[PDB]
Amino acid sequence: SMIPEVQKPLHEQLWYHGAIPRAEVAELLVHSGDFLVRESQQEYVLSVLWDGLPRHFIIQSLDNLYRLEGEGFPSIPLLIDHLLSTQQPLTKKSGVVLHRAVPKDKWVLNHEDLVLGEQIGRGNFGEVFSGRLRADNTLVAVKSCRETLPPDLKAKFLQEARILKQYSHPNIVRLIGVCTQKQPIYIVMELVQGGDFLTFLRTEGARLRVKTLLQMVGDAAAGMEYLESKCCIHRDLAARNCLVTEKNVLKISDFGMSREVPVKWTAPEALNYGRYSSESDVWSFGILLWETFSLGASPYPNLSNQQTREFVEKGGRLPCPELCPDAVFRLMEQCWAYEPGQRPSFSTIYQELQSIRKRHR
Ligand SMILES: COc1cc(N2CCC(N3CCN(C)CC3)CC2)ccc1Nc1ncc(Cl)c(Nc2ccccc2S(=O)(=O)C(C)C)n1
């Protein structure tokens, strides 16, 4: 007891995907004749899979009527339902016939489902805002994609959402939703209330006893053990990409680079040969441990990026921070073993941090 679906506004249609990039359309259509409707970079486009490729048709509008090449209709849903029913080729020259509408997935949210609050910085692709779900005031982080990035990079942006949809762990930041209906597109995450771990160490560091710091890097080890168990390589592990909850729990984030430039956190073999692995993540973990005990000082402050590569390639490593227990430094040195196979696992790291922590008041 509602109204016919075809009488609902375009923007309510399940097969209307809004501002999804042309690139992303290829990931959503499976079988011949799958289609969806979307906005273009601005008129409307009917994207339909044909011979394994998306084909894109401009829906024209003249004197309030929508059409491809024939009979015009008062709305896009009416046009869609007519093309679907008559099994008409969309245009003669293409010969393409619609077969099934592909709905938005369970994660898509409308822009109006969010209330933006204060800007909280910038990530690799745009501003990030604190905000709330309008429905229930749940606190969220809204990561925006700068509307003038290359449509090729709206892909690397939406890739973090694709990954996170499949992950669930107490030390990994949780995805809430994806706002791809309007520009600018947003990825919506739980708001981790204490901010990023770098600013935390720099602002709150004086209060963080060794026992506490060990609990927080223990959390980062548990998160990374989880990613290792999913064959997920983070590639950008650093304090700036860890977040701190209001109860001091650490969560790993920033899965844009992740896969199933920050030279100073990156393993030699990853820089030299492009070989990224969970072993190169353990290298980055050693650097994170250094940041942790240096109250967020920057690593290798005497060295350019290039000098860091060269320094490391002749056996240079970071020195032991004043606050860093000797046992933690010995662990860090294992994490930065030149031979990647000689580095400890995340399980081993977690175990040794937990053990060291019982020796601190
Ligand atoms: C309240 O929650 C947060 C506050 C801050 N800060 C950082 C320092 C900043 N001060 C403010 C003014 N001061 C004068 C100096 C600096 C205030 C707010 C930073 C991050 C969060 N929370 C948060 N949760 C989830 C995500 Cl998902 C995320 N993501 C997120 C947030 C901000 C930037 C980048 C990302 S990110 O996703 O690209 C990745 C780096 C975590 N950020």
CATH number at residue 28: 3.30.505.10
Cβ atoms 190, 219 nearer than 8 A: no
Instruction: Retrieve residue 238's tokens.
Output: 């650093």
Sequence-distant (≥ 6) Cβ neighbours of residue 106 within 8 angstroms = none
CATH number at residue 136: 3.30.200.20
User: Which residue segment(s) compose the domain that 297 sits in?
Assistant: 196-361
Q: Provide the pairing of β-strand 34-39 with 100-101.
A: parallel
- Find out whether 110 is annotated in a ligand binding site: no
SS (H, E, C) the chain: CCCCHHHCCHHHCCCECCCCCHHHHHHHCCCCCEEEEEECCCCEEEEEEECCEEEEEEEEEECCEEECCCCCECCHHHHHHHHHHHCCCCCCCCCCCCCEECCCCCCECCHHHEEEEEEEEECCCCEEEEEEECCCCCEEEEEECCCCCCCCHHHHHHHHHHHHCCCCCCCECCEEEEECCCCCCEEEEECCCCCEHHHHHHHHHHHCCHHHHHHHHHHHHHHHHHHHHCCCECCCCCHHHEEECCCCCEEECCCCCCECCCHHHCCHHHHHHCCCCHHHHHHHHHHHHHHHCCCCCCCCCCCCHHHHHHHHCCCCCCCCCCCCCHHHHHHHHHHCCCCHHHCCCHHHHHHHHHHHHCCCC
Q: Atom of ligand 1 at shortest distance to CA of 120?
A: 18
Q: How far apart are the first and last CA of the chain?
A: 65
Q: Do 232 and 285 reside in the same domain of the chain?
A: yes
Question: What is the rounded distance in angstroms from the CA atom of residue 10 to the CA atom of residue 198?
Answer: 44
The answer to whether residues 218 and 164 belong to one domain is: no
- The amino acid at residue 279 is E
Q: State whether 294 and 165 are in the same domain.
A: no
Tell which of 162, 180, 195 closes a domain.
195
Domain count, the chain: 3
41 and 150 co-located in one domain: no
Nearest CA to ligand 1 atom 28: 141
The residues annotated with a catalytic role in the active site are 236
- Ligand 1 centroid to residue 195 C-alpha, Å: 5
Resolution of this model in Å is: 1.8
180 neighbors 162 (Cβ within 8 angstroms): no
What are the phi and psi torsion angles at 9 (to 5°)? Answer: -50, 145
Residue 177, both tokens? 């939703």
Q: Do 182 and 201 sit in the same domain of this protein?
A: no
Ligand 1 centroid to 282 CA: how many Å?
24
Out of 114, 119, 120, 186, mutate this one to test ligand 1's pocket (max ligand atoms within 8 Å of CB): namely 120
Residues 6+ apart with CB under 8 A from 85: none
CA 294/CA 324 separation, integer angstroms: 8
Are 324 and 214 found together in one domain? yes
Helix axes 278-292, 346-357, angle to 10 degrees: 20
Lining ligand 1 with CB less than 6 A are 120-121, 123, 128, 130, 141, 143, 173, 189, 191-193, 195-196, 199, 240-241, 243, 253-254
Q: 110 and 75, same structural domain?
A: no
Candidates 84, 66, 83; CA nearest to 75 is 66
Going by C-beta distance under 8 Å and a sequence separation of 6 or more, which residues neighbour residue 207? none
Instruction: Tell whether 343 is in a known binding site.
Output: no
Q: What is the CATH number of the domain that holds 313?
A: 1.10.510.10
- Domain final position from 36, 63, 94: 94
In a domain, 101, yes or no: no
- Burial bucket for residue 97 (CB in 10 Å: 0-12, 13-18, 19+): middle
| Last-in-domain residue among 94, 122, 153 | 94
Query: Which residue, judged by its Cα, is nearest atom 5 of ligand 1?
Result: 195
